[PDB]
Design a binder for this molecule. Sequence first.
Ligand SMILES: *[C@@H]1O[C@H](CO)[C@@H](O[C@@H]2O[C@H](CO)[C@@H](O[C@@H]3O[C@H](CO[C@H]4O[C@H](CO[C@H]5O[C@H](CO)[C@@H](O)[C@H](O)[C@@H]5O[C@H]5O[C@H](CO)[C@@H](O)[C@H](O)[C@@H]5O)[C@@H](O)[C@H](O[C@H]5O[C@H](CO)[C@@H](O)[C@H](O)[C@@H]5O)[C@@H]4O)[C@@H](O)[C@H](O[C@H]4O[C@H](CO)[C@@H](O)[C@H](O)[C@@H]4O[C@@H]4O[C@H](CO)[C@@H](O)[C@H](O)[C@@H]4O[C@@H]4O[C@H](CO)[C@@H](O)[C@H](O)[C@@H]4O)[C@@H]3O)[C@H](O)[C@H]2NC(C)=O)[C@H](O)[C@H]1NC(C)=O
Ligand SMILES: *[C@@H]1O[C@H](CO)[C@@H](O[C@@H]2O[C@H](CO)[C@@H](O[C@@H]3O[C@H](CO[C@H]4O[C@H](CO)[C@@H](O)[C@H](O[C@H]5O[C@H](CO)[C@@H](O)[C@H](O)[C@@H]5O)[C@@H]4O)[C@@H](O)[C@H](O[C@H]4O[C@H](CO)[C@@H](O)[C@H](O)[C@@H]4O)[C@@H]3O)[C@H](O)[C@H]2NC(C)=O)[C@H](O)[C@H]1NC(C)=O
Ligand SMILES: *[C@@H]1O[C@H](CO)[C@@H](O[C@@H]2O[C@H](CO)[C@@H](O)[C@H](O)[C@H]2NC(C)=O)[C@H](O)[C@H]1NC(C)=O
Ligand SMILES: *[C@@H]1O[C@H](CO)[C@@H](O[C@@H]2O[C@H](CO)[C@@H](O)[C@H](O)[C@H]2NC(C)=O)[C@H](O)[C@H]1NC(C)=O
Lengths: 338, 338, 123, 333, 333, 334
Amino acid sequence: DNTTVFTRILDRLLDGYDNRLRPGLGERVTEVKTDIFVTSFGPVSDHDMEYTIDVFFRQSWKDERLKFKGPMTVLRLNNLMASKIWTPDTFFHNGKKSVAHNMTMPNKLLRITEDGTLLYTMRLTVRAECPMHLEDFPMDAHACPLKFGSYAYTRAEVVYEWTREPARSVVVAEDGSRLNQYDLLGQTVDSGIVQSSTGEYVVMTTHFHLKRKIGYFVIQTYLPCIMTVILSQVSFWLNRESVPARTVFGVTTVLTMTTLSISARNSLPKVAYATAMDWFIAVCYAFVFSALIEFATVNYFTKSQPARAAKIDRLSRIAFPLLFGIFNLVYWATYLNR
Amino acid sequence: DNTTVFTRILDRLLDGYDNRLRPGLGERVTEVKTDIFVTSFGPVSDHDMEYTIDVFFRQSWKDERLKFKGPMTVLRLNNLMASKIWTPDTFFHNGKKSVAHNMTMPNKLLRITEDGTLLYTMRLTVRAECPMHLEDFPMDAHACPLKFGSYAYTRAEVVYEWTREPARSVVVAEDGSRLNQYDLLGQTVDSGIVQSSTGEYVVMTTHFHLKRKIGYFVIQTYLPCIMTVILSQVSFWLNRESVPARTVFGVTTVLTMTTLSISARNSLPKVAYATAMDWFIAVCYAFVFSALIEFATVNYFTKSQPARAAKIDRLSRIAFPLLFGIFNLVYWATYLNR
Amino acid sequence: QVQLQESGGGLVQAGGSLRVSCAASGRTFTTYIMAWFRQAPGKEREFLAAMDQGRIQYYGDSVRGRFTISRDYAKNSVDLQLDGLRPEDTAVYYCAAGAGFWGLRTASSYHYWGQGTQVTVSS
Amino acid sequence: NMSFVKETVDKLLKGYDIRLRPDFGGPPVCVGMNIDIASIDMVSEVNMDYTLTMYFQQYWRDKRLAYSGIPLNLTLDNRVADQLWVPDTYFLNDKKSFVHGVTVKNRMIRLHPDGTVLYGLRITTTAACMMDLRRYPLDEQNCTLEIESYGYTTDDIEFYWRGGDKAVTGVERIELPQFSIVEHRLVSRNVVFATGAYPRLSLSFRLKRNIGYFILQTYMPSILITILSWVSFWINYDASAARVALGITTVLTMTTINTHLRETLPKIPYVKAIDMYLMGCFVFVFLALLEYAFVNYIFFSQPARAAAIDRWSRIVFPFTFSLFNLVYWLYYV
Amino acid sequence: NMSFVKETVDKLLKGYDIRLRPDFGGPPVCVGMNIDIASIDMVSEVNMDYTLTMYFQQYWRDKRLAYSGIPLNLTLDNRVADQLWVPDTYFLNDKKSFVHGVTVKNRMIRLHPDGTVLYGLRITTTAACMMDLRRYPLDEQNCTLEIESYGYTTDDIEFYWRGGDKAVTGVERIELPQFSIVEHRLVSRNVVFATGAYPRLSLSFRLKRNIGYFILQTYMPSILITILSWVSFWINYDASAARVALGITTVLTMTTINTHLRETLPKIPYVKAIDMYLMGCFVFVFLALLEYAFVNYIFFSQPARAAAIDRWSRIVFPFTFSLFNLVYWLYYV
Amino acid sequence: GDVTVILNNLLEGYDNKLRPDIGVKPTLIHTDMYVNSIGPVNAINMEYTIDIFFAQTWYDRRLKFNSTIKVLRLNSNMVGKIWIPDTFFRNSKKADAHWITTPNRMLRIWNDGRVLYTLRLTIDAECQLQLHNFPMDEHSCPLEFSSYGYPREEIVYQWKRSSVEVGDTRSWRLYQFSFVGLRNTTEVVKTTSGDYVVMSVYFDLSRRMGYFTIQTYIPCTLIVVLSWVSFWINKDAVPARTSLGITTVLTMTTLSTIARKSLPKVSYVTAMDLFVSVCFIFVFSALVEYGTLHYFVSSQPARAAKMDSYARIFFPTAFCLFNLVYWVSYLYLG
Ligand SMILES: *[C@@H]1O[C@H](CO)[C@@H](O[C@@H]2O[C@H](CO)[C@@H](O[C@@H]3O[C@H](CO[C@H]4O[C@H](CO[C@H]5O[C@H](CO)[C@@H](O)[C@H](O)[C@@H]5O[C@H]5O[C@H](CO)[C@@H](O)[C@H](O)[C@@H]5O)[C@@H](O)[C@H](O[C@H]5O[C@H](CO)[C@@H](O)[C@H](O)[C@@H]5O)[C@@H]4O)[C@@H](O)[C@H](O[C@H]4O[C@H](CO)[C@@H](O)[C@H](O)[C@@H]4O[C@@H]4O[C@H](CO)[C@@H](O)[C@H](O)[C@@H]4O[C@@H]4O[C@H](CO)[C@@H](O)[C@H](O)[C@@H]4O)[C@@H]3O)[C@H](O)[C@H]2NC(C)=O)[C@H](O)[C@H]1NC(C)=O
Ligand SMILES: *[C@@H]1O[C@H](CO)[C@@H](O[C@@H]2O[C@H](CO)[C@@H](O[C@@H]3O[C@H](CO[C@H]4O[C@H](CO)[C@@H](O)[C@H](O[C@H]5O[C@H](CO)[C@@H](O)[C@H](O)[C@@H]5O)[C@@H]4O)[C@@H](O)[C@H](O[C@H]4O[C@H](CO)[C@@H](O)[C@H](O)[C@@H]4O)[C@@H]3O)[C@H](O)[C@H]2NC(C)=O)[C@H](O)[C@H]1NC(C)=O
Ligand SMILES: *[C@@H]1O[C@H](CO)[C@@H](O[C@@H]2O[C@H](CO)[C@@H](O)[C@H](O)[C@H]2NC(C)=O)[C@H](O)[C@H]1NC(C)=O
Ligand SMILES: *[C@@H]1O[C@H](CO)[C@@H](O[C@@H]2O[C@H](CO)[C@@H](O)[C@H](O)[C@H]2NC(C)=O)[C@H](O)[C@H]1NC(C)=O
């Protein structure tokens, strides 16, 4: 009874229908309402300068060619009819290879209201570029963009808008964080215009703010280097006749700093500029290098001017801890604030 | 007009033909005769417990709906025509991800005889699961299975048989073996029944019997460990007064055993139990450890009881080679005879 | 240690059901093939049935349609339902587990063997 | 008899509309689900996901597909699935999944006289589950699979497990090289999104990691290096080259172990149990070499006190290392 | 003009049976093949395969497509290939291949007035070849490519190389980073399978591995460590700690070299020339340390005999090592 | 409205298997390219990644119409219905178009019959790199495209006024290299099936040295200086100087391994392999120097005394001279 009426409506809407033409072609500008629900903010790859995100993409627009009358004010269709109508050709400007899920069915939904308003929803896995300035590594903060718009329609044909207030038009699930080493501070929602050789296009922008977690680098790199520097200045308090004890202290701190530097630089992304960890390791290496030069000097002046050698050792016993403390204070005050 | 006559027969066979129904539906069981030709038995991965195989799959059945009369008695069919008739839905129960090749065209072939018999051949690459027991590694042997049957038709509708005697129904090419760490001994062919939540099905099975080659581990792991143990027992023949010489000797043979053990363990997959190599390495490590404990005991008793220290070194020069030779005899007789 | 203990058996009056069980201990045989064998007095040792990890059932050409094999993977056991028994079925039934190297139908490929259980058929 | 079946099937598919759900506009259609797990493998810490292979069956009743005159269940060719309506079921945490297609697409459609439709698929899916590795490798994990309808709501479709707690089979036959499945659980609930409510079914497993691999591959080398560091206490103090070489080679070996484990293990930027154990062993060998630093520093003025320190170190170091192991294993097992 | 061409093409494609080969039921259709190789790369020893990109062209005659009145060779859109008969050619040893599709499918169909068809495809394929590495890194490999018809026998189709020995071009423009192509060869034979005789064309290359990388990277460190092991023969025999440390450290260094080479080169589990050379050097330094162990053992009672053994070792070890190197660099070069 | 009538009448009597002016004159195609970003350069595989917008313009007499509408702006739904040139990239290893959320294709038609077709592409293109001067090497990586089936008598390509455009060149993923400039050319290539017009674009790239300086050059220099540290240690500290020497040798070998992990397995010596090998020779000679000093202490103590004094001058001088020649040759003489 009812199914026959519903099928006659479905077989009647598309009578003399052209999906090659946008709604309001030549009479008005089609307006699209857009909102995103982030199911999971996936991993961020520092080596590839890109990130992954799994989203529900919801678009709303008005097509007066699809008005209908019937008891059911809303009709929800799976996928065969939704491919026979006009849909916006949205694409991500900075998006790399993305995936539209097809298990166990196409993850697409099309709803129609009585007035002809259509709602189109899809599930996507967007992989987008996030340029990074790693000068403050590993104490850096980044803002990864997500920009989308119409590929073929200029701003005189199709314009995009957020469904609600811009803050409320992008929603992130509470369990939708998949960041091993980042904290998602927040997001900013924007709209604008881009200019090309084919015309002007409307672009919708979203920025996600990320802050890298530092406790890993503190326990893996910073603490061993600080302890090795402390051991190198501990060497200054042993008697000058104890050649093996001070030599082993010096050379083992040098070997430890060399090993730490090699390990530390084999994990960073290949950036051709220096970061904050490179400077910290370089200064710790130069401190243990100068400590071994200081012992080389003490051993050189021993047996000829023991008074000068003792005065050099005393001043290194004063200068080195103070200089290292001042270096750490400058380093951490500089980088933590920024 | 011979081409037009043949075209008429082709355009006449499929008149009133439904490919959604198996032959004899509701009247009799569809018998499928199957044989396999193996063109290459590809690599076996012990880490993933899987193997690759490239085969020609030949199936044969009878369809009374496809009888014809004409000048020829055998028809070769284009792959476009082979998709219009009913074919069995054979699948591999333990397959992981298989590929049907279609370069440069689909690697399918369908021949029709005058009496109504259909021969259907295809080329496939199958990655299957071969669970392994690695307690005897690297002196282990495995039986890797390959099981196939119908996904949708129960044993009341479709049954499978081998074209010839089961031994001669699976044939491997002379140059088929593409194995660098295994030796293919042979195969056994069988057939059983499985029961699922949807019904009972016929399963055709083949087992390939593999035995691992051990020369690589002999030349890479066992020989360096045996030489390191012999070197550590060479220390017993150095004079007692060379304390630093024998201490460096023992501690460097200990470091050599540790390096060899870690190198060997890198190759092994992550298994819960202990393989035969784990026991061999643990025993060699305990032997060099006891040789260094023996020298520590001699040095402890030196300069106070030189007679006992000399007696200990003289007995160690016999006991250590004897105990190691006995261990090797037991090790290489327990595992080489399985 | 690993022990395969067998239960059931006894005597039946030339018919009826007879479910022989087999419980394993000291090792989990989930990834192994568990089979049943039969030894008539002084005669050859014969393969009866077997079930692998994938629940594929293999039977001998003489007992197909009469003996049903099953496995309780949770309890790590295996059962054999003997139906339509005949006087020729009087023998000692054995339980075995193995990897099936060089053939699961050959007795020389099973690492562990049971102690047997006499089944007597009276007519 | 076969022509009558052909007529009946073509009768059913004549006028059939794929775009309308059964009982469209009326009561919701009830869909029952079965899962037959075939294998679980590749539990990846780096990728934070796992791979699952299964048989996925769905049962529902469509009155438009009811037929009479044939006392049989019709198993049809799987391409007829494209001519019928099937639920828009999807997995919420699936990263990558596919349907096997050798030698044909691994799909099944079966019809019953009352109109019940059975729809089966053989699916391999990679599902994402978060892992809390603070207790690694002595950790337990809880990984799930979420089943939901993409487009319909509870006014249109409903999900239930067919068979109660017996709806999922095959877990007892799974063998994992590094884990052992402890339990599995079935949950049915609805999720209230912005577009309305959505039926959902959830299947979860709890995994407990095995320790033998880490015992024989990770902890034993560090233990052995710690024990080897005590050999110095039994060497004469005038053997400076032997004790220095032993101390610095044990330091280099422990550093190489820690660095290469950091290179091979997954990058998990928080403190785990393995990092605490390796750091504790590094501290023990650091103190073992520092003890000789004190002895070398005092063996000339007070040779008897330095000998008493070496003798007491021969007892304190093994005792404090066994106390550390006892506390570590009590606090983690 | 244009309408005449459209009329002719629609006449050609009207009543065309794609399921029938040319001259069906009569003489076999002759197919000529050309290959133009663009590049070869990623010759993988681990996977035992190589990657090839090429322009594959086929040339046959179909009298059903002959047309008259147009003095032109009609190059059609490649989608017309879906409406025409093409050979069922396949590569036997292929593991993974695809046809490029940017900006469209890289496919060509060209017709001639006499009915001749030219069919072109741009293909990247991964072909597997067995490699014998017993002479590695002084080895020479032979990798082929097999071309066959999947479902036709010699009664219905035949293969030949179009152009004789000029059928394959582009070999001299291939630059492998680790090989040089010594030669290539073309073969034509019929493979006798069970279903019947199948035509087959074979193209093979012979690759010769470059040796300059391995001379600098592998053999020189082993040679220099072996020479350094001879330094102890010129050291006083009363310095037991120095000669023992040198001998055992050269043994440790040789082990380190072997394990580093174990980590760097591909896992090929059988005995190669590199293993024989590393074993020969390990034996030489083992006997040098056993010689010092003998000297230290006998240097007290017979100092003159020990010094004579050292004096003769200063001659024998370099001479025996040079004879070993001469045999090695003659049995392979 | 009438736009559907226009499209239906245009597609009526249209055969898309035939190029425009098939029997009259070659079809002239004007091409444009906008480079969104040039991705990482893979020296190991000798390939690079590029993302572009590709535009083509041509005339089709069959697509003329008369109306008050000047241009018909269409999406990809009509791409498969009209004739499209079969342009392909000759040196492409793997290329694909973008399909999220819809096929990224735009088609515009003017009333005079002019057709504009644009799509977005990501390409992995081949670039053979000469690494003799690595890491001070310069390259010109090409990107070539032509027609797969149509020879020069049927399809001719031609650059427009602004051929290749680049936006923010600093917003790219090039760490090792810096972008210099681009050129675009035209050539005719003769093949076995005819003569084809080939259009090429070349991108000039010069490598940055800051990374290899921080990772390799500076650590190696500091290791060499550390091996010079042994010359100022008292000769009586045998264990200390032996451990220092052998540990510096181990460190040199450790740094030496990581030098070639960023390169393919070329069999010629690069400037980096030469630098690492000379540093290895310096530390090797410093350890042989200590072995000689230790041996000479008993035999010729005065000569061994003078040996360390001579080494303190010769080794830093010879290493500074080597570095001066190395950097002069590789930075000012090639
Ligand atoms: C060996 O076997 C393999 C397979 O094992 C085989 O590969 C497959 O080959 C077939 C062709 O034989 C390919 O099918 C074509 O794919 C074209 C697009 O390819 C891209 O997309 C693929 C996925 O397709 C999904 O998405 C597209 C849109 O992007 C959509 O059109 C599809 O329907 C499909 O969408 C389904 O799934 C999504 C989720 O994924 C759902 O959201 C959605 O609801 C729906 O369910 C993708 O797989 C491709 O990637 C592969 O290939 C690229 C290279 O191309 C490679 O780089 C990748 O690595 C990967 O390998 C790729 O991204 C598609 O356009 C084709 O459809 C055409 O043509 C058919 C046939 O004539 C026709 O039926 C269609 O309607 C359509 O006609 C055109 O399409 C135009 C598109 O712009 C359109 O403008 C036109 O208007 C017209 O469309 C319609 O026309 C009618 C009539 O006018 C009109 O009424 C309509 O309104 C409408 O306008 C075709 O489907 C398949 O993709 C290949 N798969 C793979 C994995 O390679 C291989 O070829 C075999 N080799 C040999 C030698 O035999
Ligand atoms: C891995 O980790 C996951 C996540 O933590 C675990 O999954 C959780 O498992 C538990 C135990 O099975 C689940 O709790 C159960 O939830 C169901 C569903 O409740 C929903 O649907 C009901 C209708 O079917 C509905 O009535 C419920 O509404 C009530 O509850 C909500 C709660 O907010 C409340 O707001 C309402 O007012 C109602 O009161 C709800 O929508 C529920 O039916 C179960 O009830 C059992 O337990 C209760 C007592 O708690 C008892 O009274 C009942 O009689 C019954 O015995 C139960 O609460 C939980 O929902 C799962 N979490 C998620 C996210 O799905 C998983 O178990 C872990 N793995 C392993 C192996 O452990
Ligand atoms: C159509 O193609 C044929 C075959 O390639 C062309 O005939 C060849 O033309 C070349 C150039 O003149 C000659 O060297 C060959 O000898 C010809 N082949 C034969 C078999 O005679 C023909 O010229 C082409 N026609 C057009 C208009 O291009
Ligand atoms: C790309 O090609 C175009 C077309 O040939 C070049 O544009 C012309 O270049 C010539 C010199 O080769 C000038 O004389 C013309 O004035 C140019 N025409 C213009 C700019 O409209 C263009 O220079 C090429 N790009 C290069 C070489 O970088």
